[PDB]
RNA sequence: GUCUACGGCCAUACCUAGGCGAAAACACCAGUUCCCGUCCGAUCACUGCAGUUAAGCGUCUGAGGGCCUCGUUAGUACUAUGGUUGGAGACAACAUGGGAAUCCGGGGUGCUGUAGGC
RNA sequence: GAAUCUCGAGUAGAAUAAAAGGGUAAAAGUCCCCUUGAUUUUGAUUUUCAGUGUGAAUACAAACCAUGAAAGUGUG
RNA sequence: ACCUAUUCUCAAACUUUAAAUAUGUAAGACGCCCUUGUCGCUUAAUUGGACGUGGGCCAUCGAAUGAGAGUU
């Protein structure tokens, strides 16, 4: 059978990746099985609550659960610290993504717990090191996400990607 | 992409010299392989190469360390016993073949007792044992990846061997002059070969028809002014010398002074402060 | 209908009893030229035996 | 200074006759192939069964000849007066071959025989230099290098050079 | 329901190793089994002839018979509550030597070694080996190495 | 030290671009009488050395792809034994033991046996 | 790129009678040549097992042969 | 519609890798070393192979612990 939910990005999943520093996840904090139909109106319901308070453009929503194991339906298996949903905003939005996660969290059976993530964004790397990387200018934007500077491959293949990196 | 970081990581390369195609493991497994039952009976191999101006016949055991040389010549060593020319021929291979078996008898101690055929006539024998003696020496052929067809100079190395005393078990299929329509050995055919009769023939050939062939085909006889009809007779006493003495001379050759001309020849690896220093002297 | 929960207790007690090692065991099982020559071995072996023991 | 003996070579000319049906049309273009190359042709059979071509497998469908040296030449040289000497840049293969099709074979000097007809077929010229016995024998195959391997550029200069032909763009 | 066959259930028992297909190793006919001797049973299956059942994998056994291309191995197999002897003809590209059983000789030599000069000079050697004994007691300096007080880390949340 | 023949383990040996290789050896190569096989001596088979290092081959370079080791991951994931432990359950912690994998970073880019040749 | 064949790459991504898995690249695949080891007689093993039968299988031995230059391989 | 570097998330019949627990064997006097005999098997060959002979080392006799043990 069809998933309930076709769509995990929202809000503007185009954006680049320094306008958008803070990250906030709602992760389940218990091991259980979220079905997608559950999914599907939790997406709804933040992606509306959001663009009503902050606007379309403010946020993106990306939804880390995958509705994959069957039981007539599917459901998302989840264990303990697995991130449901991931919102990425500018500062100011904390309060509003906070608000908007913990109202979608009546929509989901279990226990679910909102973190503000010390990553940047969706990187990998930590607010501060983010901030150094690309200052030293390792890390360059792509789309949605950036790539990021590598020991490895050949000396003209990273240079010409990364042509203001200043290599030591 | 065709060649992907997948496609490396997935590729199973072959053994080292089945890359470079210079053994069959399919034969060798077959020619190596000794039955159990014989324990540690070592199984002689009779491997015979040909490059393009040169013949490499060996006898060799195998063991789990590597394969072992017993006895050994080299086509470069007919000078020395009288053929100049023609060092990669079937008339070579048939000499290089009979200094094999002679080293290999004189080593293992039954030169007095196998004499072989000391003069070849043609005629197709198998080294008959004695009734009271120790056997033969049997050795099987290995031909490598040279195809097996009549006439092939690797028999001829099979049929020096043969008359040299070892024990090598074959058939006149592959002989030269083998008719496979009356499933008979011409016995004439076989001496001229054995004697050189075949290139007596093509140099008699081209003096008659083609001189313009000659004198640039058959350069080193001509320099030294030796016609076709005394080949026979250079091959018989070459064979003879080759029987009197077959000791293996080894030459009086300087290594230290080939690994010093060498030595300034090969490349030294650099280090990983060289390439760093090439690195970042490049970035500047 | 069925089950193994017994049965391994039922197995060990009176043990898991190895078979009786001997010191020869049958020439049967072996090569029959091998065996039919440990015969004439053993044969002259027992005669040269004999023979020493008589002549000494 | 060029090494002399990268001077490339005609290696081979492969002459096909395809008619995509079979019978005594097939077995006469044989015997043209026969007269023009002075080689026994081998039939091409049909890999599979094609029904908008009427094809049925394994059925001897085409004849094709293969001529190597000198007389490859010559027959490559009357193809080329057929063709002016002239030859499209898209004719020469990335690997340094090319090839052209001939409609009409009366002008090649061949004898017009009403029983036998006109048959088209397609010359084709495989490109190489001497070295490809490296690749080509069975005792220590080897890969030829990328500084010796021929390019359609290459082939399109020593065609130009050695006919003195045009080949459009 | 089961399928009884000779080979079911041997999909990754005699699954060839990643990267390690295509032909066979020369080096396995070059070695010479005796009766007595030690062998491990892993079963190739690039060799579909001469194979032992899928119980034969992973044990070890003793040579009774030594065959043309073959071995045969003395295993003893759990029958309800006895043990029986089974005897396999396996083909020696399923046969190594055990190296236990090489370890187990050098060490017979050493010790025969040890005996040997222990009584050239006069002296008792100890042959047997003993299991790990209790650390001795030993000083520890603290030069340069000054011992650093750990607390244990508070929480944090780091996904 | 280099080359050849036969190999052992079977990528530190493979794939790719570029730069070198003195000697010998090897290879490319000339030819189709014969032995021999093809549509075609191009492959294979046979006779020879007139030129050539262009390629094969050997070697070097590339923060190359890959591969092999060491560390990070990590005492993490997981797991054997224990409790009249916690919790409605899910599951979790603790006590006594065993203990990985990817990512990531450092290093490495064949060694060697017998017989010979330079 | 030529009115089907041509050379570059090509770790098997194809084939191997039939289900599925394992195995296979100078082959176990596709062609070609010769062939009847798909034969006779023992015993000994393996599997399902009571270590009974049946079935299938493995390694030999005594003959007789096929094949190959040979090593060797072959009792469907 | 692709291709390139990425990226989010999974696999009972998918997998490079790969535990924990269970699992096969060895840990010697039927041992070791030397000498030497038999054979119709085996090898180029007393060369091997298998069984032996006559000697020599000799309960710290070749890990810990505990028990007498096995068969009809």
């Known amino acids: 059978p069809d998933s309930k939910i076709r769509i995990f990005d929202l809000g503007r999943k185009r954006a680049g990746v320094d306008e958008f520093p803070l990250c906030i996840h709602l992760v389940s904090n218990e091991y259980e099985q979220i079905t997608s139909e559950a999914l599907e109106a939790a997406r709804i319901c933040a992606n509306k609550y959001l663009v009503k308070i902050g606007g379309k453009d403010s946020f993106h929503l990306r939804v880390r659960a995958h509705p994959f194991h069957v039981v007539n339906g599917l459901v998302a298996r989840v264990n303990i610290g697995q991130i449901l949903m991931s919102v990425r905003t500018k500062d100011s939005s904390r309060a509003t993504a906070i608000e908007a996660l913990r109202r979608c969290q009546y929509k989901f059976p279990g226990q679910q717990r909102i973190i503000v993530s010390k990553k940047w964004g969706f990187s990998q790397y930590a607010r501060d090191e983010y901030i150094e990387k690309r200052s030293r200018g390792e890390i360059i934007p792509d789309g949605c996400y950036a790539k990021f500077l590598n020991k490895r491959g050949s000396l003209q293949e990273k240079l010409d990607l990364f042509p203001e990196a200043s290599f030591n | ?284 | 209908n069925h089950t193994n929960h017994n049965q391994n207790k039922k197995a060990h007690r009176n043990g898991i009893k190895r078979p009786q090692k001997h010191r020869y065991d049958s020439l049967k099982y072996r090569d029959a030229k091998f065996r039919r020559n440990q015969k004439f071995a053993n044969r002259g072996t027992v005669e040269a035996i004999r023979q020493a023991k008589a002549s000494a | 200074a060029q090494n002399p003996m990268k001077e490339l070579r005609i290696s081979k000319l492969v002459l096909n006759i395809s008619l995509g049906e079979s019978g005594d049309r097939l077995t006469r273009a044989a015997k043209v192939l026969e007269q023009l190359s002075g080689q026994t042709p081998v039939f091409s059979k049909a890999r599979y069964t094609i029904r908008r071509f009427g094809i049925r497998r394994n059925e001897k469908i085409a004849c094709h000849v293969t001529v190597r040296g000198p007389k490859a030449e010559e027959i490559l040289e009357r193809g080329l007066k057929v063709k002016e000497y002239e030859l499209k840049k898209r004719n020469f293969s990335a690997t340094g071959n090319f090839g052209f099709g001939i409609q009409e074979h009366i002008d090649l000097g061949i004898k017009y025989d009403p029983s036998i007809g006109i048959y088209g077929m397609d010359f084709y010229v495989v490109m190489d230099r001497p070295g490809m016995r490296v690749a080509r024998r069975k005792a220590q195959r080897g890969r030829v290098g990328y500084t010796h391997k021929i390019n359609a550029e290459d082939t399109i200069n020593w065609f130009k050079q050695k006919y003195d032909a045009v080949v459009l763009g | 329901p089961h399928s009884y066959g000779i080979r079911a259930r041997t999909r990754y028992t005699f699954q060839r190793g990643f990267r390690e297909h295509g032909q066979i190793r020369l080096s396995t006919y070059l070695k010479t089994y005796k009766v007595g001797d030690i062998v491990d049973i892993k079963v190739n299956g690039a060799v579909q002839k001469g194979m032992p059942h899928k119980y034969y994998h992973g044990k070890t056994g003793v040579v009774y018979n030594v065959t043309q291309s073959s071995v045969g191995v003395l295993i003893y197999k759990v029958v309800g509550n006895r043990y029986m002897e089974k005897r396999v003809n396996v083909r020696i590209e399923h046969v190594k030597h055990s190296k236990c059983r090489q370890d187990f000789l050098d060490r017979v030599k050493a010790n025969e070694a040890k005996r040997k000069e222990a009584k050239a000079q006069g002296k008792t050697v100890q042959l047997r080996r003993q299991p790990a004994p209790p650390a001795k007691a030993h000083f520890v300096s603290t030069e340069n190495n000054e011992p650093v007080t750990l607390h244990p880390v508070a929480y944090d949340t780091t996904i």
Request: glycine share 8%; aromatic share 12%; charged share 30%.
């Open chain 2, 1 to 284: 992409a065709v060649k992907s970081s997948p496609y490396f990581s997935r590729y199973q390369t072959k053994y080292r010299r089945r890359r470079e195609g210079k053994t069959d493991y399919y034969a060798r497994k077959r020619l190596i392989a000794q039955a159990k039952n014989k324990y540690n009976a070592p199984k002689y191999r009779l491997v015979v190469r040909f490059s393009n101006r040169f013949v490499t016949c060996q006898i060799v055991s195998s063991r789990v360390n590597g394969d072992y040389v017993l006895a050994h010549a080299h086509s470069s060593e007919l000078p020395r016993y009288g053929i100049k020319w023609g060092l990669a021929n079937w008339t070579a291979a048939y000499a290089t073949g009979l200094l094999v078996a002679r080293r290999a008898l004189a080593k293992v101690g039954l030169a007095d007792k196998y004499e072989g055929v000391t003069e070849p006539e043609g005629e197709f024998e198998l080294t008959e044992a004695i009734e009271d003696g120790p056997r033969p020496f049997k050795v099987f052929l290995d031909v490598g990846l040279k195809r097996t067809s009549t006439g092939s100079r690797v028999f001829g190395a099979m049929k020096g061997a043969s008359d040299g005393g070892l024990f090598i078990p074959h058939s006149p299929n592959r002989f030269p002059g083998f008719d496979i329509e009356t499933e008979e050995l011409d016995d004439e055919t076989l001496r001229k070969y054995i004697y050189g009769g075949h290139v007596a023939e093509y140099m008699e050939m081209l003096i008659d028809d083609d001189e313009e062939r000659y004198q640039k085909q058959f350069s080193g006889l001509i320099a030294d002014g030796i016609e076709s009809d005394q080949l026979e007779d250079i091959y018989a006493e070459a064979y003879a010398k080759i029987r009197e003495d077959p000791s293996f001379q080894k030459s009086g050759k300087d290594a230290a002074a080939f690994k010093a001309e060498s030595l300034k020849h090969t490349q030294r690896k650099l280090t990983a402060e060289e390439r760093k220093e090439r690195f970042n002297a490049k970035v500047i």
